[PDB]
Amino acid sequence: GHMGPNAVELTTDQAWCLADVLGAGSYPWVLAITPPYSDHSQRSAFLAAQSAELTRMGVVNSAGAVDPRVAQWITTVCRATQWLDLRFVSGPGDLLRGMVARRSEETVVALRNAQLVTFTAMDIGHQHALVPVLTAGLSGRKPARFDDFALPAAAGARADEQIRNGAPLAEVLEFLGVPPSARPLVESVFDGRRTYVEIVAGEHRDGHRVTTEVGVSIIDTPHGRILVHPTKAFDGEWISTFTPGSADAIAMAVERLTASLPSGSWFPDQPLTRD
Numbered sequence: 001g002h003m004g005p006n007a008v009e010l011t012t013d014q015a016w017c018l019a020d021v022l023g024a025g026s027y028p029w030v031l032a033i034t035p036p037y038s039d040h041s042q043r044s045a046f047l048a049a050q051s052a053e054l055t056r057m058g059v060v061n062s063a064g065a066v067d068p069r070v071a072q073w074i075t076t077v078c079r080a081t082q083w084l085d086l087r088f089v090s091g092p093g094d095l096l097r098g099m100v101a102r103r104s105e106e107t108v109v110a111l112r113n114a115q116l117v118t119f120t121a122m123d124i125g126h127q128h129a130l131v132p133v134l135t136a137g138l139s140g141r142k143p144a145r146f147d148d149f150a151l152p153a154a155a156g157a158r159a160d161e162q163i164r165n166g167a168p169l170a171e172v173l174e175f176l177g178v179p180p181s182a183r184p185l186v187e188s189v190f191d192g193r194r195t196y197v198e199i200v201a202g203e204h205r206d207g208h209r210v211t212t213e214v215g216v217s218i219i220d221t222p223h224g225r226i227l228v229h230p231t232k233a234f235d236g237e238w239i240s241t242f243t244p245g246s247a248d249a250i251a252m253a254v255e256r257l258t259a260s261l262p263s264g265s266w267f268p269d270q271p272l273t274r275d
Contacts, residue, residue: 003057007120008070010059012036014050015074015117018059022071024078028099030085031112073119076108077101080204082266084130084254085211086111087198088137096137100130102266109133126267126274127251134250135218135225139195143244144224146185150231150241151176153214159190182242188221195220201258212260214238216253218245229253 001009010018013036019027020043027033037043054060059067077099086098098111109120111133124130152158155176162172169187178186188194196219202211214230225245233239243249259265267273 001053001057001116001118003059003067006122007118008057008059008073009116009118010054011050012112012115012117013046014054014059015119017046017050018054018066018070019074019078022066022074024071024075027078028080028083028085028101028110030087030099031097031110031117032095033112033117069121070119072106073108073121076103076106076121077110077119079103080108082203082258082261082263083201084134084258085200085202085215086134086137088195089197090137090195098133098136100133111136124267125270127255127265128247128274130254131247131250134197134199134254135245137195137197138218138225139220141220141222141225141245143246143249144185144221144226146182146223146242146244147179148241148243149177149179149182150233150239151178151186153230153238153240155240156190185221185223185226186242188223189219189226193222199254199257201254201261203258203261203263205262210261212257216250216257218250220245227253229256 001011012033016033016035037046051060059070080101080103082102084100088096088098090096096113101108101110107122107124109122111118158176159172162175163169169190173183173186196217198215198217200212200215202209217228219226219228227243227245227249228240230238231241255265
């Protein structure tokens with residue numbers, strides 16, 4: 001990979017190895033980075049082979065120590081106190097995972113793609129600044145033009161329950177409650193063609209790790225970008241609300257997701273915070 005002043009690109013193996021050398025701990029599970037070696041003989045062989053890049057890159061100096069910036073970034077990810085897990089989904093055999101990390105006041109974005117992983121430190125003062133990070137692995141669609149509606153929770157699971165029981169997708173969508181004028185929209189969601197990301201928030205308040213039961217979804221279909229965030233009904237039951245995936249809407253769905261955690265949202269409301 002390459003080096004930068006505010007970001008670095010490594011191989012997933014190199015990234016696991018640097019975290020080992022630093023004693024940073026384990027990468028977040030969402031990144032699905034597996035150890036590239038087992039015992040010392042194989043660990044030594046790895047350090048001897050795959051280092052040449054890290055010396056050429058500046059990630060490791062002549063004394064064998066890791067660049068202090070790279071080490072701080074990796075540590076912000078492995079010991080983050082607040083975070084967003086980002087599970088991107090495109091075609092099969094592809095692996096695109098991401099995580100936004102918060103440690104003290106610093107923010108670091110780890111984005112794993114196949115055999116490479118990038119660590120990017122960035123300055124965030126509002127959720128609106130993370131939309132580009134949340135929609136990175138999508139298909140650059142403009143927000144879809146439709147009226148807000150809501151389906152039962154896990155509408156995709158419910159839909160699949162009935163497709164395996166004979167009912168065609170046509171009457172399935174009506175059963176779920178999809179407005180007639182939004183049937184092509186949802187049809188493209190559950191039809192093979194789509195790219196989406198499942199977003200979940202978590203923190204580490206005093207000892208125990210806390211995460212949100214239900215997550216936020218962002219779906220890119222040929223009809224545009226759809227935002228599906230969890231809301232409650234008049235009877236207190238969870239439902240999946242659909243709405244055009246604007247940057248402001250994405251920003252508010254994520255903000256309310258972290259606000260359900262014990263330590264509230266990341267960025268308190270402050271006057272004058274928009275560029």
